């Protein structure tokens, strides 16, 4: 059927900055016409030609128009003018889940739980979709108003070919400290790398740092390569059999992936003997203090 008409930036009064990337910028934005608010990320279409990021810019897009999820943000519209690209954005009022780590240092365990659950279950929706998102890392961990989960950035997402039953992308992306070692290794992802992404966010929500750090990126892909990370004192038994489970280097035997037989046995795991699955969503989010 028809759609509503596209918009322009002039149906919008633009306030403040929400953030910067090294291409885009997104603005909070109302629509004059319903007083909604949107996240507006734009992109000059200059820019992106000359830098060689328009397969970013149409794979964001593309990628986010199949989403439909609670857990992600949502791309409600999209248009352009003779300069510009914009995406119109749910606006996650309450930022980065780095924010958060950061300002209390250690989330408590019912904390590390219902927001572990919460992208688990993310996961589990985008990977039943046959899409990797090969960048989840805690600044693509947005939060809305009621301190859900919001996951975002999907421009290094990947959709794998249903018609090929494709398992592995070859392009090199992604954040040093949540890397997989088979990216730097056999330099390809698969939908079990964001579980190793997975492991590090919550080692990394109960002991305030990801689990392979160090000052510059050579030095943690070593470290990931061998697997050279340990424990804090007190971290919580049972997540930490979990961060054991998913910390793998061999990405066929990591807890929720393929040849484990999925999120089933990930979900019955026991850190999360107490999380209702069902309507995450609709649940009150522990205070965080
Ligand atoms: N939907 C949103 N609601 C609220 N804030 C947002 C939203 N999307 C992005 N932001 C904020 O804007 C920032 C800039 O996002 P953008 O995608 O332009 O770049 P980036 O991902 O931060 O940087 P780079 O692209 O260089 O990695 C984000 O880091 C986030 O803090
Ligand atoms: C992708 C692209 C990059 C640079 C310059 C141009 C001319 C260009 O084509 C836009 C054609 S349609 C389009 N592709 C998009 C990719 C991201 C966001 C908005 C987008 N829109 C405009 C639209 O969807 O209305
Ligand atoms: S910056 C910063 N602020 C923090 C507060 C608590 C724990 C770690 C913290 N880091 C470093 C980081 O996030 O890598």
């Not at 592995?168 to 579980?195: I, M, W």
Request: net charge positive; aromatic share 12%; glycine share 6%.
């Amino acid at each position: 059927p028809p759609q509503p008409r596209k918009k322009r930036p002039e149906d919008f009064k633009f306030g403040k900055i929400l953030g910067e990337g090294s291409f885009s910028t997104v603005v909070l934005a109302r629509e004059l016409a319903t007083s909604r608010e949107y996240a507006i990320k734009i992109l000059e279409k200059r820019h992106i030609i000359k830098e060689n990021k328009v397969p970013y810019v149409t794979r964001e897009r593309d990628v986010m128009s199949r989403l439909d999820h609670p857990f992600f943000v949502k791309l409600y519209f999209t248009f352009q003018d003779d300069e510009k690209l914009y995406f119109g954005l749910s606006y996650a009022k309450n930022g980065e889940l780095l924010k958060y780590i950061r300002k209390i240092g250690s989330f408590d365990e019912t904390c590390t739980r219902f927001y572990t659950a919460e992208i688990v279950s993310a996961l589990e929706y985008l990977h039943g979709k046959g899409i990797i998102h090969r960048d989840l890392k805690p600044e693509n961990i947005l939060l809305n108003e009621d301190m859900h989960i919001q996951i975002t950035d999907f421009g290094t997402a990947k959709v794998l070919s249903p018609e090929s039953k494709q398992a592995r992308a070859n392009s090199f992306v992604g954040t040093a400290q949540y890397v997989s070692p088979e990216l730097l290794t056999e330099k390809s992802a698969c939908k079990s790398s964001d579980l190793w992404a997975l492991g590090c966010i919550i080692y990394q929500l109960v002991a305030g740092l990801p689990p392979f750090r160090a000052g510059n990126e050579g030095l943690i892909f070593a470290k990931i390569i061998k697997l050279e990370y340990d424990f804090p004192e007190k971290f919580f038994p049972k997540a930490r059999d979990l961060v054991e489970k998913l910390l793998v280097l061999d990405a066929t035997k990591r807890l929720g992936c393929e040849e484990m037989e999925g999120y089933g046995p990930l979900k019955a795991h026991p850190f999360f003997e107490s999380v209702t699955w069902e309507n995450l969503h609709q649940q009150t989010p522990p205070k965080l203090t």
